Amino acid sequence: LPPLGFAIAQLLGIYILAQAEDSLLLIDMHAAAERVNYEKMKRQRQENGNLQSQHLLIPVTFAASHEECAALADHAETLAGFGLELSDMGGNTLAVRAAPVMLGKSDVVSLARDVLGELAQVGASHENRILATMSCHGSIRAGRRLTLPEMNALLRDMENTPRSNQCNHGRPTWVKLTLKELDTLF
Amino acid sequence: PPLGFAIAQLLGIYILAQAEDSLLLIDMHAAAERVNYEKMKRQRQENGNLQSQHLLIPVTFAASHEECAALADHAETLAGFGLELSDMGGNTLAVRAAPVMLGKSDVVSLARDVLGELAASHENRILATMSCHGSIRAGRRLTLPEMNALLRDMENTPRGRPTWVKLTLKELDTLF
Amino acid sequence: LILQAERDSLLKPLQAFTGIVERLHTLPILSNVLIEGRGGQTKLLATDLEIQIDTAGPEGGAGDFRITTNAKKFQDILRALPAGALVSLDWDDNRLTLKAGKSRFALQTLPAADFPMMNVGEDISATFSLGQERFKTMLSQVQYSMAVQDIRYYLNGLLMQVEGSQLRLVATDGHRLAYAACAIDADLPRAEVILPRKTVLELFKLLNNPDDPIQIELLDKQVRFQCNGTTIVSKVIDGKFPDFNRVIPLDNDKIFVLSRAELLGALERVSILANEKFRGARLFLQPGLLSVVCSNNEQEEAREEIEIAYQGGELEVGFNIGYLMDVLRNIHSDDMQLAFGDANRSTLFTVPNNPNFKYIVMPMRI
Amino acid sequence: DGKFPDFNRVIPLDNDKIFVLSRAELLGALERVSILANEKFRGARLFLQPGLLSVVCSNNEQEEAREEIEIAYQGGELEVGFNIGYLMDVLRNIHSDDMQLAFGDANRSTLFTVPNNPNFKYIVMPMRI
């Protein structure tokens, strides 16, 4: 499998550069990972009817605005279907006991807040909150992508996952430079 | 005196304060939400902005695409709420500064509320939407000395659930 | 002539200024050790603008002086000398002349005016002391759970918390947590600091007198450790450590005690045939038996079985084998107590009849 | 597969400045003086005078190291440069007490031998430092 590229390193915070047969390729990690996460979450939603969940140490100290607690009082079965299981601590606070896998890694409060504030005004009936709203984690925002034996895993983003070239707007998420970057040296 | 003298907490949400009458159960998160709302409005009508505080190791949100353009829209409103934040790249942002009186929190939540409100005019997103921090939610319950400072909540501040007394030996009827 | 002393009396104090001294820092003088002779006593100082370590040196010095000289060159020259030779330090303009036997070394020196010092706080909030062996044991018990360069800077360190007469060390990375505690002969207000990893390692090196105690002082965003005539000042990682009380499970009813050496050997044997990306190991807990199983891509399987004094219901649970081996190696007890809940909840690792150490790992769905 | 060089033309035959000195002491001196030498090419200068052998090194930062050894020598003086690694390797890999150093001039081969051991020879040619 000669892939898109072979990840070689990071680029100052937002790009991941990968060498291939052509040249080094600059993948916008957050954008490409948002695309692939949206794709994988919808593929895992059309099948089995729920997102993959995961628990975790150290719950989050939600702080849970008033009516979001009542939204959790409303059937949390849908919340379990989004991979987010969370519990009430008292007064008007919460804490997530389980976050969906494929995101993790921080700020689970934002994901749970998005879906829980969506639980107001039951009608659901849209299901396109699983997009950038629920994909409001993407990959790592600007910090770290390990020591490379996971960078190639994101470099495998668009293999067997469609909607590659055109992003959520049309902005490219990868290659611009070719082997003929020697012109830049003039 | 009045409103009692804090002696301890109850499981994480209550702070019970001893007075001449009896001990009073104060909903610490609700009381702090009310006092922070009043303090922020008082600091808003005067000086026209909240007190900012720069912090070490800023937190980077996620920053949905149109929220970055909302930051491109005048950020002086965000600075007026005591929230200075920059764009790191791609579609992500980080708070270089957070408002005081709220300090340590899920600062991403406050920034996200004020930034997603930028879809003009209005003023009362400084309420529980901005007081979506309050005090620390249900833990860390700082000890009795600052517990009394929290017990000075409605002192100097007016102003939807009540946040205090129920003990009238009604627990006696519940247990006798 | 500024100094004259025996080789080891100079070499040994310098060996407390190697980890902190960055061999290539952006500031050139940060590669230098500071030597200060005053009142017939010599002081050796080093810093990286974050950890500042000082100690007393030799005494055979005539006159007051303050110089900085390259740490690595000076230490290598000292260690290359015969153990027991006389060393004479002369100062000539911007040069330090080291003389030992028929050996001359003309080092170049930098002014002490440019040597940076930490503006140490004067706001001592808590001071205590404890046995160096006890503190080193606690640090060894908790150090392996620190996150190495996490997106949350407070996890890249070790929480030291004093409350009442209890000293607690907590470390976590998000997938595991190590907690150690001990009794300190003091009554202190509840304070807590987050020692950085470099501070933890340097402090680990420092504790070499197991019978003597070490004094710890908490400051305004600073911690100072004093022992063995050596003083270390370090900035703290600002922020809030997670409340460790929520992390510790209290309902894991599947409890059994087994030999730590036996389980460590079993894990070391079975890790050889484990998958290389995931490094997972499956524990099969059944009445009287615990099975450690690993398998890799090449259709190979390793399996070891351990007799256990266990009674309760069965449980299959996956673990990241590095997490298990860390606690099995850094604890020097003969036996370990395993407390299991269910397959998707935390597991508690303890020392039997020892409430002062706890270790929590979440499983992985293998 | 190939023809190895003829080592006979290699070995010098007329080195006149001969002196025997302690292997361990000379190795320690070379290790000490190499600390303040340039870390990449390691030029070490040997000054040979009756009764004294001096080893001197210097580096980029205008630092200098110098050691001296008392030896049983009476012949003419000689200043010769060397790559200190070649000097140190033989002293590290030989386990004899004394070593015999034979010099000709500062432009040609230097012979290292073990006294009363005709079965070992070691030849280094100098640099011009």
JSON list of C-alpha atoms in Angstrom, two decimals, chain B residues 37-169:
[
{"chain": "B", "resi": 37, "resn": "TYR", "atom": "CA", "xyz": [-23.69, 37.98, 38.54]},
{"chain": "B", "resi": 38, "resn": "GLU", "atom": "CA", "xyz": [-24.16, 41.02, 40.78]},
{"chain": "B", "resi": 39, "resn": "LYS", "atom": "CA", "xyz": [-20.41, 41.74, 40.93]},
{"chain": "B", "resi": 40, "resn": "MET", "atom": "CA", "xyz": [-20.04, 41.45, 37.15]},
{"chain": "B", "resi": 41, "resn": "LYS", "atom": "CA", "xyz": [-22.98, 43.77, 36.48]},
{"chain": "B", "resi": 42, "resn": "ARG", "atom": "CA", "xyz": [-21.62, 46.27, 39.02]},
{"chain": "B", "resi": 43, "resn": "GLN", "atom": "CA", "xyz": [-18.21, 46.08, 37.31]},
{"chain": "B", "resi": 44, "resn": "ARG", "atom": "CA", "xyz": [-19.97, 46.40, 33.94]},
{"chain": "B", "resi": 45, "resn": "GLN", "atom": "CA", "xyz": [-22.01, 49.58, 34.42]},
{"chain": "B", "resi": 46, "resn": "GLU", "atom": "CA", "xyz": [-18.86, 51.15, 35.90]},
{"chain": "B", "resi": 47, "resn": "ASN", "atom": "CA", "xyz": [-15.58, 51.16, 33.92]},
{"chain": "B", "resi": 48, "resn": "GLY", "atom": "CA", "xyz": [-17.50, 49.66, 30.99]},
{"chain": "B", "resi": 49, "resn": "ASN", "atom": "CA", "xyz": [-15.64, 46.34, 31.14]},
{"chain": "B", "resi": 50, "resn": "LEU", "atom": "CA", "xyz": [-14.70, 43.45, 33.40]},
{"chain": "B", "resi": 51, "resn": "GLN", "atom": "CA", "xyz": [-11.29, 43.05, 35.02]},
{"chain": "B", "resi": 52, "resn": "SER", "atom": "CA", "xyz": [-9.02, 40.92, 32.83]},
{"chain": "B", "resi": 53, "resn": "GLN", "atom": "CA", "xyz": [-6.28, 38.58, 34.05]},
{"chain": "B", "resi": 54, "resn": "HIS", "atom": "CA", "xyz": [-3.54, 37.11, 31.90]},
{"chain": "B", "resi": 55, "resn": "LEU", "atom": "CA", "xyz": [-2.73, 33.50, 32.75]},
{"chain": "B", "resi": 56, "resn": "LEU", "atom": "CA", "xyz": [0.04, 30.99, 32.15]},
{"chain": "B", "resi": 57, "resn": "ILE", "atom": "CA", "xyz": [-0.29, 28.00, 29.77]},
{"chain": "B", "resi": 58, "resn": "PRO", "atom": "CA", "xyz": [-3.43, 29.08, 27.86]},
{"chain": "B", "resi": 59, "resn": "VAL", "atom": "CA", "xyz": [-6.11, 26.50, 27.03]},
{"chain": "B", "resi": 60, "resn": "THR", "atom": "CA", "xyz": [-6.93, 25.94, 23.35]},
{"chain": "B", "resi": 61, "resn": "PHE", "atom": "CA", "xyz": [-10.58, 25.21, 22.55]},
{"chain": "B", "resi": 62, "resn": "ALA", "atom": "CA", "xyz": [-11.46, 23.61, 19.19]},
{"chain": "B", "resi": 63, "resn": "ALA", "atom": "CA", "xyz": [-12.99, 26.74, 17.67]},
{"chain": "B", "resi": 64, "resn": "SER", "atom": "CA", "xyz": [-15.63, 25.81, 15.10]},
{"chain": "B", "resi": 65, "resn": "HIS", "atom": "CA", "xyz": [-15.07, 27.52, 11.77]},
{"chain": "B", "resi": 66, "resn": "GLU", "atom": "CA", "xyz": [-17.49, 30.45, 12.01]},
{"chain": "B", "resi": 67, "resn": "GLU", "atom": "CA", "xyz": [-16.38, 31.15, 15.59]},
{"chain": "B", "resi": 68, "resn": "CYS", "atom": "CA", "xyz": [-12.94, 32.06, 14.24]},
{"chain": "B", "resi": 69, "resn": "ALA", "atom": "CA", "xyz": [-14.62, 34.62, 11.98]},
{"chain": "B", "resi": 70, "resn": "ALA", "atom": "CA", "xyz": [-16.60, 35.80, 15.01]},
{"chain": "B", "resi": 71, "resn": "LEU", "atom": "CA", "xyz": [-13.22, 36.43, 16.62]},
{"chain": "B", "resi": 72, "resn": "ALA", "atom": "CA", "xyz": [-12.33, 38.29, 13.42]},
{"chain": "B", "resi": 73, "resn": "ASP", "atom": "CA", "xyz": [-15.41, 40.34, 14.25]},
{"chain": "B", "resi": 74, "resn": "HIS", "atom": "CA", "xyz": [-14.52, 42.99, 16.83]},
{"chain": "B", "resi": 75, "resn": "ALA", "atom": "CA", "xyz": [-12.74, 41.26, 19.71]},
{"chain": "B", "resi": 76, "resn": "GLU", "atom": "CA", "xyz": [-13.03, 44.38, 21.87]},
{"chain": "B", "resi": 77, "resn": "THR", "atom": "CA", "xyz": [-16.37, 43.02, 23.07]},
{"chain": "B", "resi": 78, "resn": "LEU", "atom": "CA", "xyz": [-14.55, 39.91, 24.30]},
{"chain": "B", "resi": 79, "resn": "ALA", "atom": "CA", "xyz": [-11.98, 42.14, 26.00]},
{"chain": "B", "resi": 80, "resn": "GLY", "atom": "CA", "xyz": [-14.90, 44.02, 27.56]},
{"chain": "B", "resi": 81, "resn": "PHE", "atom": "CA", "xyz": [-15.97, 40.73, 29.15]},
{"chain": "B", "resi": 82, "resn": "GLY", "atom": "CA", "xyz": [-12.38, 40.28, 30.35]},
{"chain": "B", "resi": 83, "resn": "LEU", "atom": "CA", "xyz": [-11.67, 37.62, 27.69]},
{"chain": "B", "resi": 84, "resn": "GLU", "atom": "CA", "xyz": [-8.62, 38.13, 25.48]},
{"chain": "B", "resi": 85, "resn": "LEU", "atom": "CA", "xyz": [-8.05, 35.22, 23.12]},
{"chain": "B", "resi": 86, "resn": "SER", "atom": "CA", "xyz": [-5.90, 34.65, 20.04]},
{"chain": "B", "resi": 87, "resn": "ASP", "atom": "CA", "xyz": [-5.93, 32.32, 17.04]},
{"chain": "B", "resi": 88, "resn": "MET", "atom": "CA", "xyz": [-3.23, 29.64, 17.07]},
{"chain": "B", "resi": 89, "resn": "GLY", "atom": "CA", "xyz": [-3.85, 28.43, 13.52]},
{"chain": "B", "resi": 90, "resn": "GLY", "atom": "CA", "xyz": [-6.07, 26.19, 11.42]},
{"chain": "B", "resi": 91, "resn": "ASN", "atom": "CA", "xyz": [-9.40, 26.60, 13.22]},
{"chain": "B", "resi": 92, "resn": "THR", "atom": "CA", "xyz": [-8.35, 26.73, 16.88]},
{"chain": "B", "resi": 93, "resn": "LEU", "atom": "CA", "xyz": [-8.10, 29.52, 19.47]},
{"chain": "B", "resi": 94, "resn": "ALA", "atom": "CA", "xyz": [-6.71, 30.03, 22.98]},
{"chain": "B", "resi": 95, "resn": "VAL", "atom": "CA", "xyz": [-7.53, 32.43, 25.83]},
{"chain": "B", "resi": 96, "resn": "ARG", "atom": "CA", "xyz": [-4.48, 34.51, 26.70]},
{"chain": "B", "resi": 97, "resn": "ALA", "atom": "CA", "xyz": [-6.61, 36.15, 29.43]},
{"chain": "B", "resi": 98, "resn": "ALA", "atom": "CA", "xyz": [-9.67, 35.26, 31.50]},
{"chain": "B", "resi": 99, "resn": "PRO", "atom": "CA", "xyz": [-11.89, 37.40, 33.74]},
{"chain": "B", "resi": 100, "resn": "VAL", "atom": "CA", "xyz": [-11.11, 37.60, 37.44]},
{"chain": "B", "resi": 101, "resn": "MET", "atom": "CA", "xyz": [-13.84, 36.56, 39.92]},
{"chain": "B", "resi": 102, "resn": "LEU", "atom": "CA", "xyz": [-14.11, 33.49, 37.68]},
{"chain": "B", "resi": 103, "resn": "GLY", "atom": "CA", "xyz": [-10.44, 32.53, 37.20]},
{"chain": "B", "resi": 104, "resn": "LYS", "atom": "CA", "xyz": [-9.89, 28.78, 37.22]},
{"chain": "B", "resi": 105, "resn": "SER", "atom": "CA", "xyz": [-12.67, 27.03, 35.31]},
{"chain": "B", "resi": 106, "resn": "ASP", "atom": "CA", "xyz": [-13.53, 25.45, 32.00]},
{"chain": "B", "resi": 107, "resn": "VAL", "atom": "CA", "xyz": [-12.54, 28.81, 30.52]},
{"chain": "B", "resi": 108, "resn": "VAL", "atom": "CA", "xyz": [-13.34, 27.26, 27.14]},
{"chain": "B", "resi": 109, "resn": "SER", "atom": "CA", "xyz": [-17.00, 27.23, 28.20]},
{"chain": "B", "resi": 110, "resn": "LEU", "atom": "CA", "xyz": [-17.13, 30.95, 29.04]},
{"chain": "B", "resi": 111, "resn": "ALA", "atom": "CA", "xyz": [-15.24, 31.88, 25.87]},
{"chain": "B", "resi": 112, "resn": "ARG", "atom": "CA", "xyz": [-17.49, 29.60, 23.81]},
{"chain": "B", "resi": 113, "resn": "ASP", "atom": "CA", "xyz": [-20.66, 31.13, 25.24]},
{"chain": "B", "resi": 114, "resn": "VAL", "atom": "CA", "xyz": [-19.55, 34.71, 24.60]},
{"chain": "B", "resi": 115, "resn": "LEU", "atom": "CA", "xyz": [-18.18, 33.80, 21.14]},
{"chain": "B", "resi": 116, "resn": "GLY", "atom": "CA", "xyz": [-21.24, 31.84, 19.99]},
{"chain": "B", "resi": 117, "resn": "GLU", "atom": "CA", "xyz": [-23.41, 34.74, 21.08]},
{"chain": "B", "resi": 118, "resn": "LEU", "atom": "CA", "xyz": [-21.74, 36.65, 18.20]},
{"chain": "B", "resi": 119, "resn": "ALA", "atom": "CA", "xyz": [-24.05, 35.13, 15.56]},
{"chain": "B", "resi": 120, "resn": "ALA", "atom": "CA", "xyz": [-25.39, 42.21, 17.74]},
{"chain": "B", "resi": 121, "resn": "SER", "atom": "CA", "xyz": [-26.85, 44.28, 20.59]},
{"chain": "B", "resi": 122, "resn": "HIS", "atom": "CA", "xyz": [-28.07, 42.53, 23.80]},
{"chain": "B", "resi": 123, "resn": "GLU", "atom": "CA", "xyz": [-26.32, 42.76, 27.17]},
{"chain": "B", "resi": 124, "resn": "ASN", "atom": "CA", "xyz": [-27.53, 39.95, 29.45]},
{"chain": "B", "resi": 125, "resn": "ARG", "atom": "CA", "xyz": [-25.28, 37.13, 28.47]},
{"chain": "B", "resi": 126, "resn": "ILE", "atom": "CA", "xyz": [-23.29, 38.18, 31.55]},
{"chain": "B", "resi": 127, "resn": "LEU", "atom": "CA", "xyz": [-25.89, 36.26, 33.60]},
{"chain": "B", "resi": 128, "resn": "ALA", "atom": "CA", "xyz": [-25.82, 32.52, 34.38]},
{"chain": "B", "resi": 129, "resn": "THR", "atom": "CA", "xyz": [-24.68, 32.04, 30.78]},
{"chain": "B", "resi": 130, "resn": "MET", "atom": "CA", "xyz": [-21.49, 33.89, 31.76]},
{"chain": "B", "resi": 131, "resn": "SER", "atom": "CA", "xyz": [-22.03, 32.68, 35.34]},
{"chain": "B", "resi": 132, "resn": "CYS", "atom": "CA", "xyz": [-21.85, 29.14, 33.88]},
{"chain": "B", "resi": 133, "resn": "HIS", "atom": "CA", "xyz": [-18.84, 28.99, 36.13]},
{"chain": "B", "resi": 134, "resn": "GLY", "atom": "CA", "xyz": [-20.28, 30.18, 39.46]},
{"chain": "B", "resi": 135, "resn": "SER", "atom": "CA", "xyz": [-18.18, 28.78, 42.25]},
{"chain": "B", "resi": 136, "resn": "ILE", "atom": "CA", "xyz": [-16.37, 25.49, 41.88]},
{"chain": "B", "resi": 137, "resn": "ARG", "atom": "CA", "xyz": [-19.19, 23.20, 40.86]},
{"chain": "B", "resi": 138, "resn": "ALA", "atom": "CA", "xyz": [-19.41, 20.49, 43.53]},
{"chain": "B", "resi": 139, "resn": "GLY", "atom": "CA", "xyz": [-15.86, 19.98, 44.84]},
{"chain": "B", "resi": 140, "resn": "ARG", "atom": "CA", "xyz": [-12.88, 21.71, 46.43]},
{"chain": "B", "resi": 141, "resn": "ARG", "atom": "CA", "xyz": [-15.22, 23.52, 48.74]},
{"chain": "B", "resi": 142, "resn": "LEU", "atom": "CA", "xyz": [-12.52, 25.80, 50.19]},
{"chain": "B", "resi": 143, "resn": "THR", "atom": "CA", "xyz": [-12.42, 25.69, 53.95]},
{"chain": "B", "resi": 144, "resn": "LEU", "atom": "CA", "xyz": [-14.22, 27.68, 56.64]},
{"chain": "B", "resi": 145, "resn": "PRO", "atom": "CA", "xyz": [-12.22, 30.97, 56.49]},
{"chain": "B", "resi": 146, "resn": "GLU", "atom": "CA", "xyz": [-13.18, 31.67, 52.86]},
{"chain": "B", "resi": 147, "resn": "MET", "atom": "CA", "xyz": [-16.46, 29.87, 53.53]},
{"chain": "B", "resi": 148, "resn": "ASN", "atom": "CA", "xyz": [-17.41, 32.91, 55.61]},
{"chain": "B", "resi": 149, "resn": "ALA", "atom": "CA", "xyz": [-16.39, 35.16, 52.71]},
{"chain": "B", "resi": 150, "resn": "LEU", "atom": "CA", "xyz": [-18.86, 33.20, 50.59]},
{"chain": "B", "resi": 151, "resn": "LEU", "atom": "CA", "xyz": [-21.36, 33.65, 53.48]},
{"chain": "B", "resi": 152, "resn": "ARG", "atom": "CA", "xyz": [-21.06, 37.38, 52.79]},
{"chain": "B", "resi": 153, "resn": "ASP", "atom": "CA", "xyz": [-22.77, 36.76, 49.42]},
{"chain": "B", "resi": 154, "resn": "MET", "atom": "CA", "xyz": [-25.93, 38.87, 49.75]},
{"chain": "B", "resi": 155, "resn": "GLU", "atom": "CA", "xyz": [-24.02, 41.44, 51.79]},
{"chain": "B", "resi": 156, "resn": "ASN", "atom": "CA", "xyz": [-23.39, 44.40, 49.44]},
{"chain": "B", "resi": 157, "resn": "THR", "atom": "CA", "xyz": [-25.40, 42.59, 46.73]},
{"chain": "B", "resi": 158, "resn": "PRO", "atom": "CA", "xyz": [-29.16, 42.51, 46.04]},
{"chain": "B", "resi": 159, "resn": "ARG", "atom": "CA", "xyz": [-31.05, 39.92, 43.95]},
{"chain": "B", "resi": 160, "resn": "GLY", "atom": "CA", "xyz": [-34.27, 31.73, 40.67]},
{"chain": "B", "resi": 161, "resn": "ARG", "atom": "CA", "xyz": [-34.27, 29.33, 43.61]},
{"chain": "B", "resi": 162, "resn": "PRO", "atom": "CA", "xyz": [-33.64, 30.56, 47.17]},
{"chain": "B", "resi": 163, "resn": "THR", "atom": "CA", "xyz": [-30.17, 29.77, 48.50]},
{"chain": "B", "resi": 164, "resn": "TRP", "atom": "CA", "xyz": [-30.63, 29.47, 52.29]},
{"chain": "B", "resi": 165, "resn": "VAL", "atom": "CA", "xyz": [-32.47, 28.48, 55.44]},
{"chain": "B", "resi": 166, "resn": "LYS", "atom": "CA", "xyz": [-34.70, 25.46, 55.86]},
{"chain": "B", "resi": 167, "resn": "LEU", "atom": "CA", "xyz": [-33.64, 24.25, 59.34]},
{"chain": "B", "resi": 168, "resn": "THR", "atom": "CA", "xyz": [-36.49, 24.97, 61.75]},
{"chain": "B", "resi": 169, "resn": "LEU", "atom": "CA", "xyz": [-36.37, 21.56, 63.42]}
]
